[PDB]
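Appendix C. Worked example: Isoform 2 of Caseinolytic peptidase B protein homolog
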Amino acid sequence: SNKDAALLEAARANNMQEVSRLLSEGADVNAKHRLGWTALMVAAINRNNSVVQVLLAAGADPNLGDDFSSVYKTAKEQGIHSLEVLITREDDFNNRLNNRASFKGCTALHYAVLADDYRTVKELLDGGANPLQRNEMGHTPLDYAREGEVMKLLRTSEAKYQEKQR
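Step 2, the predicted output written as structure tokens:
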């Protein structure tokens, strides 16, 4: 309800104390914004490592995909005005992303890689996030990475996936 919306706002704010309280009051740990993203997603894109750990410890699914596509596609798909979609995505999710691109199926790991924050990536991988999972465009978290530790962290986890699969 409003408690699910309060969860997402606290996730954006990195307010771990508030996230834990709302979770204790029955907020859905996998609640989705009307435009299609989760609390773990909005925490990941904003480098909110503190809240990511709280969400993972409370059972958040790290492999869900954003139902948000682009301002253009989501405006038509859902029948909202494009300016409202753009403002909402910039204000309630992130304003440094190119939201003209397509994000459908992006997981929290996708967003954590786009933010170039090794700590959030490492925590998401320890929470069971699939580094081989593709978005609607077919891109994995690797495909969004850049030369650095984030790639290396991904490469070893991807290597361990082949090793530890069943």
